[PDB]
Design a protein around this nucleic acid. Structure first.
Length: 94
RNA sequence: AUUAAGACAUUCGUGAGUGAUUUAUUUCCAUGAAGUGGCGU
């Protein structure tokens, strides 16, 4: 998709030739990627209602974390520095 | 006046009749409508 790296492309295969697919996501991610990082998001009750609410939480969390990574967060009142910044100013501090 | 004289190789006659420039052949192969957020710790 467009901006698929941020998560608007997620698919899984269920039936291959009318046979269920027991493929572990964790193991395949471990195999084909250099680093794989899991985050357990607090699914506040629901989980049976408001997939729209689930999407809102998931994508707000992604925006949160990725804005944290390469930039800061000058939003409401809480300041956390850019970890992309903090990496370079620490390693060989120039 | 002499084994001489006389005599168009000529008349008639369609290079014509039959017969598809046709048969076979993918305008196709490769290819992300995608990338990035920025601003006041």
């Amino acid at each position: 998709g467009t901006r698929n790296n941020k998560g608007f492309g997620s698919f899984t295969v269920e039936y291959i030739n009318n046979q269920k697919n027991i493929c572990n996501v964790e193991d395949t991610l471990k195999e084909n990627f250099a680093f794989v990082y899991k985050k357990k998001i607090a699914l506040s009750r629901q989980s049976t209602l408001d997939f729209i609410y689930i999407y809102n939480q998931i994508f707000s969390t992604i925006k949160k974390d990725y804005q944290i990574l390469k930039s800061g967060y000058n939003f409401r009142n809480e300041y956390i520095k850019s970890l992309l910044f903090c990496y370079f100013v620490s390693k060989y501090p120039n």
